[PDB]
């Protein structure tokens, strides 16, 4: 009684699931070959990023012992990146399998204390990257909930966009890096909130008369603005 | 030719992906949904109404708010059944044995 | 009125809405004041379908 007879058609018919498998098992069914994802991009640890940090490009320090070899983003990518899907793009900035900095706690109270002091969340440390399908499902559910909350709201799509950008930037595992990307949409939502309040509650101001040199040149057109 | 997509352009990449030999329905990508809160919400609502766990599990039903079905499955029914018959008989359409049915389906769906 | 002017007094599509700098306008709104509020001195309007 052999185990898994009908379960490896990839082996029976020489079908590679990916170019790495193709290169390994020598099926040679990928015309363009394979450029291997190096190990520093396949795995690694969280690092500091800003140039205004003294420990820049250095691994993040945790209460637990952790390998200090860092994930290196793709800074000099090749011109032709044949797969421009999210699957192949995400590997340039995060490792798909997550970082290698996760703990195995010898006790429950260590876990408790780390969480209590803000140095551990399983959401963050025992997790992979999210797939495009997962991101889209989350975004669409959130959009449905927001539309149900209020259709006649102008900041709707802005809230949806900040959610979308956080999900795409993988804020579960890199929240500070993602907030750095999404605070612009938060700021735009903050503006839209006041613009809506001032339209609902009629707020206006006495505008001054027109300036003597509103036009720089007499032959120039003074395009009227609301 | 296929240049790198920076991280700032990924939100547009998710809903307007590049062209492939196997593309999705970009017009329907905002309609793909799968609720992880369906059964928890159902249980919470029923237990708040006052039912027991057994009654809730008997009354539970799976979510209808999922990704919509392909209309080709209802419009191209006979063509698809014939193609699957051809494939089952001819070993998956090796050396172009189901090209007849596949081309008929492609023409019907595309129209130049 | 703007939507009708664009679509030539003919049947427009469903759930069509106007936006300026990401901010959706109500249909019973004055375009001038809505632009003054949402997009001051950037009157670029966009017409989109709001299904959601």
């Amino acid at each position: 009684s052999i185990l898994g007879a009908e379960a490896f058609p990839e082996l029976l018919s020489k079908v590679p699931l990916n170019p790495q498998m193709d290169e390994d098992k020598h099926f040679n069914k990928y015309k363009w070959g394979n450029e291997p994802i190096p190990v520093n991009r396949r795995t690694g640890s969280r690092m500091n990023s800003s140039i205004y940090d003294n420990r820049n490009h250095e691994a993040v320090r945790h209460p637990w012992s952790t390998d200090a070899r860092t994930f290196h983003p793709n800074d000099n990518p090749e011109a032709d990146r044949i797969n421009t899907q999210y699957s192949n793009m995400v590997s340039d900035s995060f490792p798909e399998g997550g970082f290698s900095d996760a703990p195995r706690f010898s006790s429950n109270w260590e876990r408790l204390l780390a969480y209590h002091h803000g140095l551990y969340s399983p959401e963050k440390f025992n997790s992979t990257t999210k797939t495009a399908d997962e991101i889209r499902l989350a975004v669409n559910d959130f959009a449905a909930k927001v539309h149900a909350d209020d259709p006649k709201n102008a900041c709707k799509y802005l809230m949806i966009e900040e959610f979308k950008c956080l999900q795409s930037a993988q804020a579960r595992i890199d929240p500070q890096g993602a907030a750095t990307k999404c605070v612009k949409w938060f700021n735009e939502w903050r503006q839209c909130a006041w613009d809506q309040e001032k339209m609902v509650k009629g707020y206006n101001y006495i505008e001054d008369r027109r300036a003597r040199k509103h036009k720089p040149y007499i032959g120039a057109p003074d395009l009227q603005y609301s | 030719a296929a240049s790198t997509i920076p991280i700032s352009q990924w939100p547009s990449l998710l809903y307007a992906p590049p062209s492939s030999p196997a593309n999705p329905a970009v017009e329907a990508l905002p309609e793909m949904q799968f609720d992880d809160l369906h059964y928890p919400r159902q249980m919470l609502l029923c237990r708040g109404a006052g039912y027991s766990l057994e009654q809730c599990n008997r009354m539970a039903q799976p979510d209808a708010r999922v990704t919509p079905e392909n209309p080709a499955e209802k419009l191209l029914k006979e063509e698809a059944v014939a193609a699957i018959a051809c494939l089952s008989q001819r070993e998956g359409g090796k050396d172009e044995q189901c090209r007849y049915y596949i081309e008929r389906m492609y023409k019907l769906a595309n129209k130049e | 009125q703007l939507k009708a002017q664009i679509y030539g007094g003919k049947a427009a599509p469903e759930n069509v809405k106007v936006a300026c700098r990401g901010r959706v306008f109500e249909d019973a709104d004055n375009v001038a004041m809505a632009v003054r509020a949402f997009c001051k001195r950037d009157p670029r309007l966009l017409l989109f379908q709001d299904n959601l």
Binding site: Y157 | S12, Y15, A16, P30 | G22, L46, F48, Q49
Partner: peptide, 8 residues
């Protein structure tokens, strides 16, 4: 579609 997918 959403208004932010527009760029041009």
């Amino acid at each position: 579609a959403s208004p932010m997918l527009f760029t041009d």
